[PDB]
Structure formats: C-alpha cells, structure tokens
Amino acid sequence: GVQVETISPGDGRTFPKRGQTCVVHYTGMLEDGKKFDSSRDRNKPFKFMLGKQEVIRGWEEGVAQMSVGQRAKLTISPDYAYGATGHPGIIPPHATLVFDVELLKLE
Amino acid sequence: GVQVETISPGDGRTFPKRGQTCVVHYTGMLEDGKKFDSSRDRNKPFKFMLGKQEVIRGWEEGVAQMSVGQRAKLTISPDYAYGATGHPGIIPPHATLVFDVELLKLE
Ligand SMILES: CC1(C)COC(=O)CCCCCCCCCCCOC(=O)[C@@H]2CCCCN2C(=O)C1=O
Ligand SMILES: CC1(C)COC(=O)CCCCCCCCCCCOC(=O)[C@@H]2CCCCN2C(=O)C1=O
Numbered sequence: 001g002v003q004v005e006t007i008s009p010g011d012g013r014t015f016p017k018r019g020q021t022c023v024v025h026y027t028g029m030l031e032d033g034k035k036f037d038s039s040r041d042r043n044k045p046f047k048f049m050l051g052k053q054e055v056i057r058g059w060e061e062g063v064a065q066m067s068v069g070q071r072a073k074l075t076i077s078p079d080y081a082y083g084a085t086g087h088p089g090i091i092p093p094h095a096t097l098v099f100d101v102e103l104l105k106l107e
Numbered sequence: 108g109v110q111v112e113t114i115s116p117g118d119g120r121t122f123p124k125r126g127q128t129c130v131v132h133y134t135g136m137l138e139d140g141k142k143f144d145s146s147r148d149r150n151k152p153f154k155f156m157l158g159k160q161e162v163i164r165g166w167e168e169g170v171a172q173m174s175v176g177q178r179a180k181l182t183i184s185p186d187y188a189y190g191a192t193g194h195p196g197i198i199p200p201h202a203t204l205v206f207d208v209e210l211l212k213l214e
Contacts, residue, residue, distance in 0.1 A: 034115070084140030092114050092178065092207050093140055 010070025117177030
C-alpha cells in the first residue's frame with residue numbers, strides 16, 4: 001500500500017481536505033535508490049488537487065496523512081503506483097517507488 | 108529474435124565477453140506484463156556464464172549487447188526462448204517473453 005515515515009514533523013493540525021490543492025516539494029527514486037525526478041532540481045514546487053485523482057493512489061493516500069510543514073518518506077508498492085505498465089521511459093514494470101515529500105502549503 | 112529496448116543506459120563501452128559471469132537482476136513477464144518470476148522478489152542477483160548456453164538464446168544474445176549498468180527490456184520470440192515445449196505450468200508453447208534485465212556487473 002503506501003507506508004508514510006516522518007523525516008520532519010509538520011504542525012500536526014492542518015491536514016489536506018479533498019478538494020484542496022497541495023503544494024509540495026519531492027524527490028522520487030526507485031526502491032534501489034536510483035533517483036528519477038525531483039521538483040527541487042527545477043525549484044518549482046509541484047501542485048495537485050487532492051481527490052482529483054491526477055496523481056498515483058499512493059500519493060493521494062499518503063499525502064492526505066500529512067500536515068503542513070511535514071517532510072515524510074512514502075514507499076509505494078506497485079499496485080498503488082504504476083503497476084505492470086510503469087511510466088514509459090522513466091519507471092520500469094512492477095516498481096516499488098520511494099518518494100521524499102514535503103508539504104509546503106495548502107491552497 | 109530478441110529486441111533490446113533501453114530503460115536506463117550503461118557505460119556503452121563494457122560489454123560482456125564469452126566466459127564471463129554476468130550478474131543481473133531481472134523480472135520475467137508474458138506480453139501482458141504478468142510476471143512469472145523475478146530475482147528482485149527473492150532479493151538475489153541471478154548469475155550465468157555468457158557462452159555456456161545455460162540460459163535461453165535470447166538472453167545470451169540480448170545480454171551480450173548490453174553494457175554494465177544498463178537496464179533494458181528484452182522482447183524474445185519463442186524460437187529464441189522455449190519454442191513449442193514452453194516451461195511446464197509457467198510458460199505456454201510459442202510464447203513471446205518479455206524480461207526486464209539490469210546488468211549489475213561482470214565477474
Ligand atoms: C511522472 C514521474 C515518473 C516523472 O515526473 C516528471 O518527470 C516531471 C513531473 C512534472 C509535473 C507533471 C506531473 C503531472 C502529475 C501526473 C503524473 C503522475 O505522477 C505522479 O503521480 C507522481 C507524483 C507527482 C510527481 C509526479 N510523479 C511521478 O511519479 C514522477 O515523478
Ligand atoms: C525458468 C524460469 C521460468 C523460472 O526461473 C526461476 O525460477 C529462476 C530460479 C533462480 C535460478 C535457478 C537457475 C536457473 C538457470 C537457468 C534456467 C533457464 O532459465 C532461463 O534461461 C531464463 C532466463 C534466466 C532466468 C531464468 N529464466 C526463466 O525463463 C525463468 O524465470
């Protein structure tokens with residue numbers, strides 16, 4: 001499923017609600033440590049609307065467990081990520097993905 | 108034959124030679140992405156001697172054209188795999204096989 005593991009505590013009070021835009025910085029890597037992308041390298045935070053289902057299930061369910069200001073490591077099994085397909089040219093088939101996510105703010 | 112499609116490049120200069128032990132991680136799938144075996148799943152690299160014929164011909168010709176650190180998707184026709192006999196209870200007769208292979212190192 002998605003396992004969430006705190007790197008830095010957030011405020012423990014403001015959790016995203018469905019319909020809110022989460023603003024995050026992230027780095028994603030394959031289970032073996034090979035990194036495949038980071039918004040920090042573009043220094044452009046990534047934004048998505050929770051509930052809209054435009055990101056993988058592991059992100060929808062993992063980020064909803066986070067409060068503003070938290071930095072956490074989410075390790076996402078293949079069924080909550082890209083499955084047998086992968087993401088062409090970046091993610092291989094059946095890959096467990098590990099993401100370091102920081103929830104900057106809600107909009 | 109075997110088609111090699113690269114997921115991530117290796118050095119493009121250290122290719123395996125006859126008699127060397129190739130150390131790889133792999134996932135074996137039928138064309139629909141259904142996984143029938145994976146070394147990753149038992150967390151043990153697979154090792155074989157290039158030129159010994161102990162692995163199907165698509166693996167001997169496919170991995171000979173990979174360089175260290177490369178991860179590639181090999182699509183193997185049945186005549187380079189198990190032909191009409193298949194592999195009892197896992198692979199059907201005349202099945203095209205897809206393997207995700209990462210050449211981790213040479214010994
Ligand atoms: C796509 C992928 C492989 C690679 O992403 C990029 O190379 C650039 C991202 C630029 C922003 C557009 C992304 C649109 C989101 C929809 C793609 C689904 O992606 C995901 O769910 C996760 C989590 C959010 C970051 C992207 N994401 C990922 O799995 C990734 O990191
Ligand atoms: C056998 C099969 C269905 C199942 O394989 C295993 O269960 C591997 C067990 C671990 C190693 C045992 C020694 C296997 C020696 C090689 C046997 C022939 O297999 C093959 O050529 C291909 C390619 C290499 C991985 C095994 N391979 C395959 O076609 C497979 O994945």
